[PDB]
Amino acid sequence: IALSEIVSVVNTSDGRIEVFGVGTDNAVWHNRQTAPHSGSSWTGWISLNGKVTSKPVVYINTDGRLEVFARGTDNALWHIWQTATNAGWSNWQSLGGTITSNPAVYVNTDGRIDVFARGTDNALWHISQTAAHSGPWSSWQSLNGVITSNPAVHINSDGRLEVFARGTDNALWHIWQTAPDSNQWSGWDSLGGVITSDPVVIGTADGRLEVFARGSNNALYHIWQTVPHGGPWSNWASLNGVITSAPAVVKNSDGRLEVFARGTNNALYHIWQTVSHSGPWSNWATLNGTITSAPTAVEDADGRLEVFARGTDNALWNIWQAWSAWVSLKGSLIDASAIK
Amino acid sequence: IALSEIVSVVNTSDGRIEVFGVGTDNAVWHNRQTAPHSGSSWTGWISLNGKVTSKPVVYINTDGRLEVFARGTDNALWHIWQTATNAGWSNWQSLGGTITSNPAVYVNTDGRIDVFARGTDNALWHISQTAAHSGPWSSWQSLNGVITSNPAVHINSDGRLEVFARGTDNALWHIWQTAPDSNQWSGWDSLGGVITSDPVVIGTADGRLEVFARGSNNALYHIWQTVPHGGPWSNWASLNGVITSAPAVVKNSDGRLEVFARGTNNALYHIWQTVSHSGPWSNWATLNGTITSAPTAVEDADGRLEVFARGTDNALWNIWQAWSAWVSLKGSLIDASAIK
Numbered sequence: 001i002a003l004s005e006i007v008s009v010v011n012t013s014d015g016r017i018e019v020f021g022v023g024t025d026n027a028v029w030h031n032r033q034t035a036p037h038s039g040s041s042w043t044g045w046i047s048l049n050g051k052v053t054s055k056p057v058v059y060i061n062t063d064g065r066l067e068v069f070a071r072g073t074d075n076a077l078w079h080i081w082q083t084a085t086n087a088g089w090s091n092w093q094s095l096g097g098t099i100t101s102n103p104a105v106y107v108n109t110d111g112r113i114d115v116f117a118r119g120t121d122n123a124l125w126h127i128s129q130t131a132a133h134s135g136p137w138s139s140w141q142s143l144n145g146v147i148t149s150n151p152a153v154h155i156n157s158d159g160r161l162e163v164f165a166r167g168t169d170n171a172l173w174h175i176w177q178t179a180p181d182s183n184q185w186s187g188w189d190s191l192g193g194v195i196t197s198d199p200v201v202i203g204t205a206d207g208r209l210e211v212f213a214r215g216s217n218n219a220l221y222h223i224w225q226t227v228p229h230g231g232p233w234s235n236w237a238s239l240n241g242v243i244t245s246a247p248a249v250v251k252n253s254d255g256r257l258e259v260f261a262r263g264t265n266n267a268l269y270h271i272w273q274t275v276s277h278s279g280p281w282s283n284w285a286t287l288n289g290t291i292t293s294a295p296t297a298v299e300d301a302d303g304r305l306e307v308f309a310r311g312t313d314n315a316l317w318n319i320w321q322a323w324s325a326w327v328s329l330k331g332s333l334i335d336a337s338a339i340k
Numbered sequence: 341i342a343l344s345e346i347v348s349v350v351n352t353s354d355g356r357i358e359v360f361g362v363g364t365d366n367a368v369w370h371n372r373q374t375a376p377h378s379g380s381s382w383t384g385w386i387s388l389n390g391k392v393t394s395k396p397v398v399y400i401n402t403d404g405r406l407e408v409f410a411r412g413t414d415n416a417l418w419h420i421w422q423t424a425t426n427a428g429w430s431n432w433q434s435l436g437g438t439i440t441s442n443p444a445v446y447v448n449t450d451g452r453i454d455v456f457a458r459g460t461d462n463a464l465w466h467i468s469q470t471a472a473h474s475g476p477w478s479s480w481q482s483l484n485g486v487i488t489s490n491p492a493v494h495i496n497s498d499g500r501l502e503v504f505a506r507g508t509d510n511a512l513w514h515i516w517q518t519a520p521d522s523n524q525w526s527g528w529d530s531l532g533g534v535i536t537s538d539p540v541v542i543g544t545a546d547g548r549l550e551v552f553a554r555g556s557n558n559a560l561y562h563i564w565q566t567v568p569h570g571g572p573w574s575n576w577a578s579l580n581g582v583i584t585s586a587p588a589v590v591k592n593s594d595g596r597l598e599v600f601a602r603g604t605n606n607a608l609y610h611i612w613q614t615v616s617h618s619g620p621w622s623n624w625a626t627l628n629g630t631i632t633s634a635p636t637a638v639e640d641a642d643g644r645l646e647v648f649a650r651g652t653d654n655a656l657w658n659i660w661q662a663w664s665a666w667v668s669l670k671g672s673l674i675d676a677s678a679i680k
């Protein structure tokens with residue numbers, strides 16, 4: 001499994017980017033822009049405490065309250081949430097279970113968060129809010145299968161959640177809601193290939209799921225729905241390059257997809273759709289630096305891509321689509337990924 | 341009340357703009373881009389039938405299904421919906437009541453559509469889905485007050501719905517959910533001023549509501565929350581000009597607000613934030629043409645603003661942020677606004 005993303009990042013409901021990572025104390029720490037603009041100063045690192053043994057995953061509730069999901073030292077799923085939009089935090093609370101992957105988090109069309117994680121049986125399990133942005137949570141429920149990567153989840157343009165994960169054959173597999181807001185899940189389906197990273201999945205400007213992963217030759221590959229929220233899927237297509245981290249995907253303000261990954265020389269590289277969301281892909285270009293994690297990309301309140309990656313000093317570094325000079329957010333981050 | 345918008349417009353879940361207007365037969369007709377790109381050809385006008393006596397208002401359910409709300413010849417609220425995302429339509433169904441305004445439509449954080457309309461008592465009434473993107477609908481319920489414009493609704497950055505309407509003193513009044521997804525509504529509050537148009541309301545890139553309306557001198561005015569999802573509100577500020585239609589507001593792909601209105605010479609004019617979502621406003625610039633409605637603006641799948649307005653031939657005309665030459669979508673539209 002290619003070197004993981006080290007932070008979970010979100011553009012908050014007041015347009016300030018907030019980043020969540022794991023400190024050398026295995027606590028979750030966060031850092032937020034002081035202002036909703038490219039090149040803003042930062043609050044600096046503030047601890048949410050806890051003791052995590054996964055990548056922490058933040059998600060924005062449909063009422064704007066941030067909620068962080070992470071595996072605990074007891075291998076249960078834990079969460080912590082803002083008690084008001086962009087204000088103070090709850091205490092950590094256990095959602096129980098015994099999980100063996102990073103959590104994958106998405107919200108249903110009814111505002112109920114759904115959390116996916118590998119179980120001790122290596123099956124895909126999930127648990128969900130029983131009310132919009134609210135407990136109590138459901139029972140843990142199995143979607144079966146046997147998976148060998150962290151899962152990734154995205155909503156279809158018709159409101160059906162869809163989960164992607166590597167199988168025991170190293171192929172990309174996926175499973176989906178057959179109706180929004182439901183525990184009517186499909187059978188597992190193979191999209192084939194051989195992937196050597198977690199998959200990442202995004203929704204296109206024309207309402208199709210598209211999945212990115214590293215292949216056996218360490219090139220970036222992608223595959224997509226050929227119709228909105230539906231099969232058949234394309235063949236795998238190479239975006240070439242040689243990448244030494246998981247790829248991170250993000251949509252530009254104009255709908256153009258862009259992918260970030262570490263190269264052989266440990267520099268940050270990127271590749272993007274040109275002209276429009278239906279235009280031809282660029283060639284790889286370097287953004288220099290020396291990074292010791294996969295990059296994480298998010299669009300800021302100015303419509304500019306922002307990229308975060310750990311540096312050789314274990315600080316989190318930032319670069320944005322001006323591109324800007326590399327800037328340090330300081331801190332000391334560890335890779336707590338549950339699957340490496 | 342300044343000349344109304346003549347169409348309801350939405351960027352659908354597969355990135356194609358769809359427009360809804362009223363034909364000379366008082367039926368609702370729609371027209372959709374063939375492709376998710378600026379300057380796309382159009383399907384041409386297709387009837388949803390019905391007999392409406394308001395502006396029709398389309399809203400996208402959280403599962404991607406379009407739903408149109410309009411007053412019927414019996415003065416009840418009627419609706420019609422897609423049975424699948426971007427596919428076929430239901431039959432018209434009555435939601436009952438007796439309404440005296442255009443409907444104002446928004447979705448709660450739990451995916452339940454809320455529809456607001458003036459009653460025969462000139463109070464603000466509302467009715468809502470009792471389940472995410474689903475009937476059955478609630479009882480009609482009064483929020484009291486006495487209003488003299490069509491209502492406008494927007495969600496706060498903390499998930500609380502907020503409704504704006506002109507009062508008997510010609511001031512801008514507003515009322516809000518004190519909690520998301522609830523019938524706990526606040527008291528009416530006056531934002532003062534004297535408005536001679538329906539208000540339009542939008543959410544800023546930094547999570548604040550901002551309201552635009554024509555003033556007694558026919559200048560464009562605006563007022564805003566000074567903090568995310570909260571008071572106090574700013575003073576009214578003039579954006580000047582002399583406008584002969586309701587203003588239409590839209591957010592650029594980069595968060596910059598932009599307003600469209602008809603000028604004294606019946607040309608389309610616009611004014612925009614420069615530099616960023618926190619930058620200084622431009623001066624008014626003409627986009628020429630001769631329009632016989634207020635304009636309606638929406639962002640397309642290429643991140644470009646698209647504007648629609650009725651022409652002197654009663655066709656719907658289109659111009660986009662290339663700016664492009666004016667292009668006719670043909671058809672023959674009427675202003676069915678319930679308040680003129």
Ligand SMILES: C[C@@H]1O[C@H](O)[C@H](O)[C@H](O)[C@H]1O
Pocket residue numbers: 252256258272273305321323
């Ligand atoms: C604006 C343009 O956008 C591309 O997607 C890429 O990030 C380029 O480096 C940038 O200059």
Ligand SMILES: C[C@@H]1O[C@H](O)[C@H](O)[C@H](O)[C@H]1O
Pocket residue numbers: 592596598612613645661663
């Ligand atoms: C790109 C730029 O955006 C502005 O908001 C305005 O629409 C201008 O006319 C356009 O040229």
Ligand code: NA
Pocket residue numbers: 004005006007293294295296308309310
């Ligand atoms: Na990262």
Ligand code: NA
Pocket residue numbers: 012013014060064065066085086
């Ligand atoms: Na937020």
Ligand code: NA
Pocket residue numbers: 037038039040306318320
């Ligand atoms: Na920055």
Ligand code: NA
Pocket residue numbers: 060061062063107111112113132133134
């Ligand atoms: Na939620």
Ligand code: NA
Pocket residue numbers: 107108109110159160161177179180181182
């Ligand atoms: Na759903």
Ligand code: NA
Pocket residue numbers: 011015016017033035036037038299300301302
């Ligand atoms: Na920002």
Ligand code: NA
Pocket residue numbers: 344345346347633634635636648649650
């Ligand atoms: Na219009």
Ligand code: NA
Pocket residue numbers: 352353354400404405406425426
């Ligand atoms: Na749609």
Ligand code: NA
Pocket residue numbers: 377378379380646658660
């Ligand atoms: Na167009």
Ligand code: NA
Pocket residue numbers: 400401402403447451452453472473474
């Ligand atoms: Na809905």
Ligand code: NA
Pocket residue numbers: 447448449450499500501517519520521522
């Ligand atoms: Na709500």
Ligand code: NA
Pocket residue numbers: 351355356357373375376377378639640641642
């Ligand atoms: Na479009």
